[PDB]
Amino acid sequence: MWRIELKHAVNWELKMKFFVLPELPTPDVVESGVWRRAIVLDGRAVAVMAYPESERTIVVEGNFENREWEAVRRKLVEYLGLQNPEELYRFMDGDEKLRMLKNRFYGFGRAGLMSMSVFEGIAKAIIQQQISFVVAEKLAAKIVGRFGDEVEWNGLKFYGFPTQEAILKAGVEGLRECGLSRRKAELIVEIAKEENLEELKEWGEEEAYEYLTSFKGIGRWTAELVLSMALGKNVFPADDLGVRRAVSRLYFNGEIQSAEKVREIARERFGRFARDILFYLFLYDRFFSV
Ligand code: NA
Ligand code: NA
C-alpha cells in the first residue's frame, strides 16, 4: 500500500476511459475502476494495481519491494499522466477550441503514455499500422495471452507485455499464430533483437526519429506515434487520421485538412503542450464522432 499525492484533482474515470478495451488484458486490465498489470522490474514480473482513494490521491498496491516504490511511482506517474496540469489548463484556456476540449474532458489532466516500455510502444505502434484500434488491441491481447507474463497476486491475475526475450522465443511464427501479418511479425522480431532499446526514451527527438525510421517498414507516422505516445516527446503525429479529423472538425469546420496543414495548426496553437493536446484529440475523435 502506497499513496501518490497530487497537487491537483484528476478525474480517474476519464483517465480509464482512454483505454479502448479495458476489460481485456492488453496487457492492462481495468475492472470496477481498478487499473492493473504486471510489469517487469529488475528481471522479474511484479503485480501492480492503482485506484483513487480521493480526487487527489491514487492508491497503489503490489508485490514489489518497499525499496522499489520510488521507481514504480515514477513509472506510474509517467504512464498514467498524473503530473500537475495547472500550466496545461491555463494554456488550453487561451485557445477557443483547446478550452472546449479541456471542458469536455475536464480532469483528464496531462498525457500519460501508451506503453510501460519502449519495446511495448514500438511493437504496438507496428501492430496498429493500417488497422482499426480495436483490432490492434485484440491482437496485442492475443500476444500478451501467449507470450506475456502472468502474475497471480491477492486473488487476481496481472498480465504483462512480452519481454524482448519472450518475443525472440516466440519468433515470427509465434506472432503470425496470434493473427499478425508476416511482415509485422518480422519487424517486431527485428526490433526485439535491439539491445539497450529502453535507452531510446532518453534520446533527442532527432536521433530517435532517424533510428526508428531506419527500420524498413517504419515510416513517419509510426515513428512520430512512438515518439509522442511511447517516448513522451513533444512530437505531433499529424499523419494520424484521427488527429487530422479532430483538428479539421475543431479548426476548419469539419473540412478534412492535409497533414501539413494540421502540422501548421499544432505549431501555431498547441506549442509545448502538443503531446498533451494529442490525447484530448484522440478522445474527441473517439467520443464526439441514411
Ligand atoms: Na485492457
Ligand atoms: Na523506414
Distance 236 CA to ligand 1 centre (A): 25
34-41 and 29-31: which strand pairing?
A: antiparallel
Same domain, 149 and 106: no
Q: Are residues 88 and 119 in the same domain?
A: no
Which set of grid coordinates corresponds to residue 220?
Answer: 513517419
Radius of gyration, CA atoms only, the chain: 19
Determination technique for this PDB entry?
A: X-ray
Ramachandran angles phi, psi of 54, nearest 5°: -165, -175
Please tell me the distance from the alpha carbon of residue 95 to that of residue 271, in angstroms, as a whole number. Answer: 12
Is-contact 143 188, C-beta < 8 A?
A: no
* C-alpha separations of 56 from 3, 7, 10 in Å: 10, 7, 6
What CATH code is carried by the domain that includes residue 256? Answer: 1.10.1670.10
Judgement on whether residues 260 and 228 belong to the same structural domain of the protein: no
Residue 248's SS3 state is: helix
The x, y and z cell numbers of residue 23, run together, are 476489460
* Last residue in a domain, options 113, 138, 155: 113
Residue 193 in grid coordinates: 533483437
What secondary structure does DSSP assign to 196-219, as a single string?
TGGGGGGS-HHHHHHHHHTSTT--
Closest-approaching ligand to the CA atom of 25: 1
Long-range pairs, 172-175, Cβ under 8 A, ≥24: 174/146, 174/147, 175/143
The total number of structural domains in the chain stands at 3
CA of 162 to the centre of ligand 1 (A): 15
How far is the centre of ligand 1, averaged over its atoms, from the C-alpha of 277 (Å)? 23
Q: With contact defined as beta carbons under 8 Å apart, do 214 and 223 qualify? A: no
Output the CA 240–ligand 2 centroid distance in Å.
17
> How many CB atoms are located within 10 Å of the residue 31 CB?
11
Residues 25, 159 contacting (CB under 8 angstroms): yes
- Residue pair 79/161 in contact by the 8 Å Cβ criterion: no
Is residue 246 within 8 Å of 285, Cβ to Cβ? yes
Which residues, in sequence order, are CB contacts of 166 under 8 Å at separation 6+? Answer: 147, 148, 149
Identify whether residues 9 and 95 lie together within a single domain: yes
Both 102 and 120 in one domain: the answer is: no
Residues 6+ apart with CB under 8 A from 53: 3, 59
Give me the amino acid identity at 8: H
d(CA 264, CA 235): 13
The phi, psi pair for 40, rounded to 5°, reads: -85, 120
Domain shared by 256 and 281, yes or no: yes
CATH number at residue 218: 1.10.340.30
Our CA angle for 162, 64, 192, nearest 5°, is 20
Domain containing 142 equals 114-233
E-strand spans in the chain? 2-5, 29-31, 34-41, 44-54, 57-62, 150-153, 156-159
Distance, CA of 221 to CA of 213 (rounded, Å) = 10
* Dist. CA 272–CA 28, nearest whole Å: 29
129-150 as b/e: b if 16+ CB within 10 A: beeeeeebbbbbbbbbeebbbe
The answer to whether residues 148 and 75 belong to one domain is no
Catalytic member of 28, 95, 149, 240: 240
Co-location of 125 and 185 in the same domain: yes
Ligand at minimal distance from the CA of 126 is 2
Look at the alpha carbons of 144, 108, 243, 220 in this order and tell me if their dihedral is positive or negative: negative
> Do 91 and 122 lie in a common domain?
no
**Beta-carbon neighbour count of residue 199 at 10 Å?**
10
Give catalytic status of residue 149 as yes or no.
Answer: no
